[PDB]
Amino acid sequence: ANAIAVGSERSADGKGMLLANPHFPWNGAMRFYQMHLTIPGRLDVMGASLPGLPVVNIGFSRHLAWTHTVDTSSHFTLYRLALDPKDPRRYLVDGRSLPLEEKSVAIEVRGADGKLSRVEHKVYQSIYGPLVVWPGKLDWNRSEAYALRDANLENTRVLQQWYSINQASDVADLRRRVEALQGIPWVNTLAADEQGNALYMNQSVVPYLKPELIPACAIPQLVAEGLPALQGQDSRCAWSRDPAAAQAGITPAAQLPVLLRRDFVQNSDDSAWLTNPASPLQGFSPLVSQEKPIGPRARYALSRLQGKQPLEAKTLEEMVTANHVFSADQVLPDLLRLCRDNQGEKSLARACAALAQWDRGANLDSGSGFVYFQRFMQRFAELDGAWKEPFDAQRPLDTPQGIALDRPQVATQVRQALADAAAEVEKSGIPDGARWGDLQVSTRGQERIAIPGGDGHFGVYNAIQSVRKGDHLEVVGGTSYIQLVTFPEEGPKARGLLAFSQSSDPRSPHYRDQTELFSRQQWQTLPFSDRQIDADPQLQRLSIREGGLAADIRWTAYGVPHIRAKDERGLGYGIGYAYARDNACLLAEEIVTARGERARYFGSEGKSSAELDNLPSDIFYAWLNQPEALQAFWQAQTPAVRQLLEGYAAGFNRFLREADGKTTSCLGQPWLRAIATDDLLRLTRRLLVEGGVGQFADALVAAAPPGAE
Ligand SMILES: CCCCCCCCCCCCCC(=O)N[C@@H](CCC(=O)N[C@H](Cc1ccc(O)cc1)C1=NCC[C@@H](C(=O)NCC(N)=O)N1)C(=O)O
């Protein structure tokens, strides 16, 4: 993700300004969806959110605009256990042997001959949490095993937190509602408001260890691999329980980085350190924020944001639509000198020509040099001492830079990496003179739409991640919801797109209408006031009831629903109905995943949208969403949240009762069925653990002791 909040001192109009550009999948449980929610007098906020959630995750209201980026804090800890030398099913805490908890789950699998079979798996849990095995790496042998405590497994405030965010009026109000509830799982928060404040917050759920305990409790080699690993045989290494924290064992708000400014704040998924170099954030816990080099996306943003010139909204827009490969600025000059110097080797002929013609961009009409440059960087990045100016912690904006072509070995190393990378390119039969837009596409039914942008690792702000599928590169994630908000006196003027369009269903009119506009990088008005909404020639209005539940739904262009209701139940009613019309098949599938029933419907020869095999994914979510977990989670929800969720499941089921396949391709499938509120709790918890134990779902299923059946 990228995010830039400009305050009154740097904005051309003297008011707040926010650029929101998260990078998320183009399919599955994390596919963003535009919506505008309104409960008159209490709630009116527009933006985008994740499937199944009756709140807005990134958006804006009349005086405020906020967004999220991934942070560098830890949201879980790996605990290395010391096993009882006489029983690998027992572990030691301060030298005392304790039994491992044993919990059985059962899964149903549909065989090839349609028959059903039951699979039972045992999950072992320590006082820290479930045991995980990364075979070969985090083994369960006779002296040690590994457990994983996910801090968000105990976060029941997650939906209450965003619903509170949706009611925030400005930056001060926003800062209060997040600090008080501490419900954000694993993202930063940046925001601007009409009065010209710019806010950055590393306010999330972070395990708490007092600073003096960290050098002793941390495992150095594993922390060196970026893993938050603690000693699990020492009671002094349990998470510290500060009574000022909203959840037992997490870091209280006052210790997490916050920066309020009137010039600007930015973040492109690095630590809080360089949110604004004029005001560095240092001296925090290493579980919270370290002073490490920033990625090229942040360097690009900071280079363009330097100085004191007033910024226009189109300047923020063009920082994305430019598709500038910022990493070439540090490598391409030296690389082209090498290229001309070696105008003899006929091998390097094609690559050097493409690199010389390359416009240093990732646009649709950018030359094939971008492909050559990409493969070169992958092999240049695995070479120590190749940077002429290596990283200097005192110049982290200008460093590293340049190729040290002066030394004899690196010169022939860089020439070797270029020669290797060039061979890989022509080994794929890519035509001569092919442009980037001819290669990177997004499949829409039977056709392909060219998608500009490139992978963020190369400093492309408009980060686009794709994989090779057949004769092209299929876009899999990246720039999703785009939001650029300013605050003229008339009202919030917002402008953006949903790159993959509102509906994942090919039958829908909103399956590729915004993807075509993204291909041409034509951002559109996001209508918020009733004047813009009601003056749309494409407006469609409809009221629905049952019971009770009622909602007033307006649809503007590209299928963006605007839901008006009297209470949370009716608000959820409209949300569930509108989202089902666009994405009923997506949610039906993801609910089957979060229920642990993929092998029941699709058999064991399949994968989930998370590229997890059907059987291990089922075992994990059966453990994660067992009924005791759902009951305990539900009983911890505020009444408003429970009414939102109840309304959603009703609005979803209301559409299924009327569905005739017009915008629903999975009509007739046995897994397309009415949903309950607990199904929505499963999707929520599935998203919660995505910053922690969810990333270890296969490792949890793999954990078995020596012996055992
Ligand atoms: C109920 C719950 C509801 C939740 C509601 C959530 C609503 C908010 C949505 C969040 C949107 C952010 C997603 C997003 O925007 N991710 C990005 C993540 C991008 C990313 O983080 N990319 C870097 C590499 C990088 C960094 C800086 C650059 O400038 C360029 C590249 C990285 N990726 C892999 C992990 C990590 C790493 O490995 N480094 C540690 C190490 N030791 O090396 N860093 C991506 O999905 O694309």
Short mmCIF file of N, CA and C in Angstrom, two decimals, residues 42-140:
data_model
loop_
_atom_site.label_atom_id
_atom_site.label_comp_id
_atom_site.label_asym_id
_atom_site.label_seq_id
_atom_site.Cartn_x
_atom_site.Cartn_y
_atom_site.Cartn_z
N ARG A 42 -26.39 9.86 12.29
CA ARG A 42 -25.41 9.06 13.00
C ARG A 42 -24.25 8.59 12.14
N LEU A 43 -24.48 8.29 10.87
CA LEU A 43 -23.47 7.65 10.04
C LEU A 43 -23.66 8.03 8.59
N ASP A 44 -22.58 8.47 7.94
CA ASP A 44 -22.60 8.69 6.50
C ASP A 44 -21.16 8.68 6.02
N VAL A 45 -20.75 7.57 5.40
CA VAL A 45 -19.35 7.36 5.03
C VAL A 45 -19.33 6.50 3.78
N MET A 46 -18.40 6.81 2.88
CA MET A 46 -18.28 6.12 1.61
C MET A 46 -16.86 5.61 1.44
N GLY A 47 -16.73 4.45 0.81
CA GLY A 47 -15.42 3.88 0.55
C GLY A 47 -15.51 2.46 0.04
N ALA A 48 -14.53 1.66 0.43
CA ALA A 48 -14.46 0.26 0.03
C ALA A 48 -14.13 -0.59 1.24
N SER A 49 -14.51 -1.87 1.16
CA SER A 49 -14.29 -2.81 2.25
C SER A 49 -14.16 -4.22 1.68
N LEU A 50 -13.86 -5.16 2.58
CA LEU A 50 -13.57 -6.56 2.27
C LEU A 50 -14.85 -7.39 2.33
N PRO A 51 -14.89 -8.49 1.57
CA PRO A 51 -16.12 -9.29 1.49
C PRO A 51 -16.58 -9.77 2.86
N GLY A 52 -17.87 -9.59 3.14
CA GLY A 52 -18.50 -10.07 4.35
C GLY A 52 -18.61 -9.07 5.47
N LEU A 53 -17.98 -7.89 5.35
CA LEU A 53 -17.89 -6.96 6.46
C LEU A 53 -18.91 -5.84 6.30
N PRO A 54 -19.80 -5.62 7.27
CA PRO A 54 -20.80 -4.55 7.12
C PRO A 54 -20.29 -3.19 7.61
N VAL A 55 -19.06 -2.85 7.24
CA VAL A 55 -18.44 -1.56 7.57
C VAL A 55 -17.58 -1.15 6.39
N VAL A 56 -17.14 0.11 6.40
CA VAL A 56 -16.20 0.62 5.41
C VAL A 56 -14.80 0.57 6.00
N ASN A 57 -13.88 -0.07 5.28
CA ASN A 57 -12.51 -0.24 5.77
C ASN A 57 -11.60 0.91 5.37
N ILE A 58 -11.80 1.47 4.17
CA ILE A 58 -11.04 2.63 3.70
C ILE A 58 -12.02 3.57 3.01
N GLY A 59 -12.06 4.82 3.45
CA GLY A 59 -13.01 5.74 2.86
C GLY A 59 -12.94 7.17 3.37
N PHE A 60 -14.09 7.83 3.44
CA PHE A 60 -14.13 9.24 3.81
C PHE A 60 -15.55 9.61 4.21
N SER A 61 -15.65 10.67 4.99
CA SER A 61 -16.94 11.26 5.35
C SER A 61 -16.88 12.74 4.96
N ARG A 62 -17.76 13.55 5.55
CA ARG A 62 -17.87 14.93 5.11
C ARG A 62 -16.62 15.74 5.45
N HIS A 63 -15.95 15.41 6.55
CA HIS A 63 -14.79 16.18 6.97
C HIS A 63 -13.51 15.36 7.11
N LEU A 64 -13.53 14.07 6.78
CA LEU A 64 -12.42 13.19 7.11
C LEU A 64 -12.19 12.18 6.00
N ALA A 65 -10.93 11.80 5.81
CA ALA A 65 -10.54 10.74 4.89
C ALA A 65 -9.40 9.95 5.50
N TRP A 66 -9.54 8.62 5.53
CA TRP A 66 -8.54 7.75 6.13
C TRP A 66 -8.27 6.57 5.21
N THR A 67 -7.18 5.86 5.50
CA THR A 67 -6.79 4.69 4.73
C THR A 67 -5.81 3.88 5.57
N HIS A 68 -5.36 2.74 5.03
CA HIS A 68 -4.52 1.81 5.77
C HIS A 68 -3.38 1.29 4.90
N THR A 69 -2.24 1.04 5.55
CA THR A 69 -1.10 0.36 4.94
C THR A 69 -0.62 -0.71 5.90
N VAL A 70 0.13 -1.67 5.38
CA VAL A 70 0.70 -2.74 6.20
C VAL A 70 1.86 -2.17 7.01
N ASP A 71 1.91 -2.52 8.30
CA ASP A 71 2.96 -2.02 9.18
C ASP A 71 4.07 -3.06 9.31
N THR A 72 5.13 -2.68 10.03
CA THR A 72 6.27 -3.56 10.28
C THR A 72 6.31 -4.07 11.71
N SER A 73 5.26 -3.84 12.49
CA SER A 73 5.21 -4.36 13.84
C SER A 73 4.92 -5.86 13.83
N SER A 74 5.21 -6.51 14.95
CA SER A 74 4.82 -7.89 15.13
C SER A 74 3.40 -7.95 15.70
N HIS A 75 2.62 -8.91 15.22
CA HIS A 75 1.25 -9.11 15.68
C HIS A 75 1.05 -10.50 16.24
N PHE A 76 2.14 -11.25 16.37
CA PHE A 76 2.16 -12.58 16.97
C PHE A 76 3.59 -12.81 17.43
N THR A 77 3.78 -13.86 18.24
CA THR A 77 5.13 -14.29 18.58
C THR A 77 5.23 -15.80 18.43
N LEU A 78 6.34 -16.24 17.83
CA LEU A 78 6.73 -17.65 17.85
C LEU A 78 7.42 -17.97 19.17
N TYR A 79 6.96 -19.02 19.84
CA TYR A 79 7.56 -19.48 21.09
C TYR A 79 8.26 -20.81 20.85
N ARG A 80 9.57 -20.85 21.08
CA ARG A 80 10.32 -22.10 21.03
C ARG A 80 10.17 -22.82 22.37
N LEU A 81 9.60 -24.02 22.34
CA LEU A 81 9.37 -24.78 23.56
C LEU A 81 10.55 -25.69 23.85
N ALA A 82 10.84 -25.87 25.13
CA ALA A 82 11.81 -26.85 25.60
C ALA A 82 11.05 -28.09 26.05
N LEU A 83 11.28 -29.21 25.37
CA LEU A 83 10.51 -30.41 25.64
C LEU A 83 11.09 -31.19 26.81
N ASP A 84 10.21 -31.85 27.55
CA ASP A 84 10.62 -32.79 28.58
C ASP A 84 11.44 -33.90 27.95
N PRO A 85 12.71 -34.08 28.34
CA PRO A 85 13.56 -35.10 27.69
C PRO A 85 13.00 -36.51 27.76
N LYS A 86 12.02 -36.78 28.61
CA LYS A 86 11.44 -38.11 28.72
C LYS A 86 10.09 -38.24 28.03
N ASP A 87 9.47 -37.12 27.64
CA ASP A 87 8.20 -37.18 26.92
C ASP A 87 8.07 -35.99 25.97
N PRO A 88 8.18 -36.20 24.66
CA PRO A 88 8.03 -35.09 23.71
C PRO A 88 6.62 -34.52 23.66
N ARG A 89 5.65 -35.12 24.35
CA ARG A 89 4.31 -34.56 24.49
C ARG A 89 4.19 -33.63 25.70
N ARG A 90 5.28 -33.39 26.41
CA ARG A 90 5.31 -32.48 27.55
C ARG A 90 6.40 -31.44 27.34
N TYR A 91 6.17 -30.24 27.86
CA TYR A 91 7.11 -29.14 27.69
C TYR A 91 7.37 -28.46 29.03
N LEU A 92 8.50 -27.75 29.09
CA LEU A 92 9.02 -27.22 30.33
C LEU A 92 8.82 -25.72 30.39
N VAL A 93 8.36 -25.25 31.55
CA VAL A 93 8.30 -23.83 31.87
C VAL A 93 8.99 -23.67 33.22
N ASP A 94 10.12 -22.96 33.24
CA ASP A 94 10.95 -22.83 34.43
C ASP A 94 11.28 -24.21 35.01
N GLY A 95 11.62 -25.14 34.11
CA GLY A 95 12.08 -26.46 34.48
C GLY A 95 11.00 -27.45 34.86
N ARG A 96 9.73 -27.06 34.84
CA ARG A 96 8.65 -27.96 35.24
C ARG A 96 7.91 -28.50 34.02
N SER A 97 7.66 -29.80 34.03
CA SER A 97 7.05 -30.47 32.89
C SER A 97 5.53 -30.28 32.91
N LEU A 98 4.99 -29.82 31.78
CA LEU A 98 3.56 -29.56 31.63
C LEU A 98 2.99 -30.36 30.46
N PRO A 99 1.76 -30.84 30.57
CA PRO A 99 1.16 -31.59 29.46
C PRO A 99 0.69 -30.67 28.35
N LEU A 100 0.80 -31.16 27.12
CA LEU A 100 0.24 -30.45 25.98
C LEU A 100 -1.26 -30.70 25.90
N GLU A 101 -2.02 -29.64 25.65
CA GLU A 101 -3.44 -29.80 25.38
C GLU A 101 -3.64 -30.52 24.05
N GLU A 102 -4.65 -31.39 24.00
CA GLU A 102 -4.98 -32.13 22.79
C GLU A 102 -6.43 -31.87 22.41
N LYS A 103 -6.65 -31.44 21.17
CA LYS A 103 -7.96 -31.09 20.67
C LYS A 103 -8.16 -31.74 19.31
N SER A 104 -9.26 -32.47 19.16
CA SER A 104 -9.54 -33.19 17.93
C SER A 104 -10.56 -32.43 17.09
N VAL A 105 -10.30 -32.37 15.78
CA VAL A 105 -11.25 -31.83 14.82
C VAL A 105 -11.53 -32.91 13.78
N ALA A 106 -12.70 -32.81 13.15
CA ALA A 106 -13.14 -33.81 12.18
C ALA A 106 -13.61 -33.12 10.91
N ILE A 107 -13.18 -33.64 9.77
CA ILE A 107 -13.45 -33.08 8.45
C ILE A 107 -14.12 -34.16 7.60
N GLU A 108 -15.01 -33.73 6.71
CA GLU A 108 -15.66 -34.62 5.75
C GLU A 108 -15.08 -34.39 4.36
N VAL A 109 -14.74 -35.48 3.68
CA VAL A 109 -14.11 -35.43 2.36
C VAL A 109 -15.01 -36.16 1.38
N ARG A 110 -15.24 -35.56 0.21
CA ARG A 110 -16.01 -36.18 -0.85
C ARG A 110 -15.06 -36.94 -1.76
N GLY A 111 -15.18 -38.26 -1.78
CA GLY A 111 -14.33 -39.08 -2.62
C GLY A 111 -14.66 -38.94 -4.09
N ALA A 112 -13.83 -39.58 -4.92
CA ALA A 112 -14.02 -39.51 -6.36
C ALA A 112 -15.33 -40.16 -6.79
N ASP A 113 -15.77 -41.19 -6.07
CA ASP A 113 -17.03 -41.87 -6.34
C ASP A 113 -18.20 -41.27 -5.57
N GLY A 114 -18.13 -39.99 -5.21
CA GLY A 114 -19.21 -39.31 -4.52
C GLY A 114 -19.40 -39.69 -3.07
N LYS A 115 -18.76 -40.74 -2.58
CA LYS A 115 -18.93 -41.14 -1.19
C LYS A 115 -18.25 -40.16 -0.24
N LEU A 116 -18.76 -40.10 0.99
CA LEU A 116 -18.22 -39.23 2.01
C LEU A 116 -17.38 -40.03 3.01
N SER A 117 -16.32 -39.40 3.50
CA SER A 117 -15.45 -40.00 4.49
C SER A 117 -15.05 -38.94 5.51
N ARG A 118 -14.71 -39.40 6.71
CA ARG A 118 -14.36 -38.51 7.82
C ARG A 118 -12.86 -38.57 8.07
N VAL A 119 -12.25 -37.39 8.22
CA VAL A 119 -10.85 -37.27 8.57
C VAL A 119 -10.77 -36.56 9.91
N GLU A 120 -10.06 -37.17 10.86
CA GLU A 120 -9.86 -36.59 12.18
C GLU A 120 -8.40 -36.19 12.34
N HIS A 121 -8.18 -34.99 12.89
CA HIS A 121 -6.84 -34.49 13.14
C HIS A 121 -6.76 -33.91 14.54
N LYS A 122 -5.61 -34.10 15.17
CA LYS A 122 -5.37 -33.63 16.53
C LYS A 122 -4.48 -32.40 16.50
N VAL A 123 -4.92 -31.34 17.16
CA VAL A 123 -4.16 -30.10 17.27
C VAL A 123 -3.65 -30.00 18.70
N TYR A 124 -2.34 -29.86 18.85
CA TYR A 124 -1.73 -29.72 20.17
C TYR A 124 -1.55 -28.25 20.51
N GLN A 125 -1.91 -27.89 21.74
CA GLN A 125 -1.84 -26.51 22.19
C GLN A 125 -1.05 -26.42 23.49
N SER A 126 -0.16 -25.44 23.56
CA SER A 126 0.55 -25.08 24.78
C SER A 126 -0.17 -23.91 25.43
N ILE A 127 0.35 -23.47 26.58
CA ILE A 127 -0.19 -22.27 27.22
C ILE A 127 -0.03 -21.05 26.33
N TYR A 128 0.93 -21.08 25.41
CA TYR A 128 1.09 -20.00 24.45
C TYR A 128 0.10 -20.13 23.30
N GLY A 129 -0.03 -21.32 22.74
CA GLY A 129 -0.96 -21.55 21.67
C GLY A 129 -0.70 -22.84 20.93
N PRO A 130 -1.27 -22.96 19.73
CA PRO A 130 -1.09 -24.20 18.96
C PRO A 130 0.36 -24.38 18.55
N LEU A 131 0.77 -25.64 18.44
CA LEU A 131 2.11 -25.94 17.97
C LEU A 131 2.11 -25.93 16.45
N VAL A 132 3.21 -25.44 15.88
CA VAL A 132 3.36 -25.34 14.43
C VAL A 132 4.66 -26.03 14.04
N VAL A 133 4.65 -26.70 12.89
CA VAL A 133 5.84 -27.36 12.37
C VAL A 133 6.05 -26.93 10.92
N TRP A 134 7.19 -26.28 10.67
CA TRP A 134 7.68 -25.98 9.33
C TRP A 134 8.68 -27.07 8.99
N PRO A 135 8.28 -28.14 8.30
CA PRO A 135 9.14 -29.33 8.21
C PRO A 135 10.52 -28.97 7.70
N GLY A 136 11.55 -29.37 8.44
CA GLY A 136 12.91 -29.01 8.09
C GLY A 136 13.43 -27.76 8.78
N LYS A 137 12.52 -26.86 9.13
CA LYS A 137 12.88 -25.56 9.70
C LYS A 137 12.42 -25.38 11.14
N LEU A 138 11.13 -25.51 11.44
CA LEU A 138 10.63 -25.51 12.82
C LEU A 138 10.12 -26.91 13.11
N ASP A 139 11.04 -27.81 13.43
CA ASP A 139 10.69 -29.21 13.62
C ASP A 139 10.15 -29.46 15.03
N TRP A 140 9.50 -30.61 15.19
CA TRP A 140 9.07 -31.12 16.49
C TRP A 140 9.90 -32.37 16.75
#
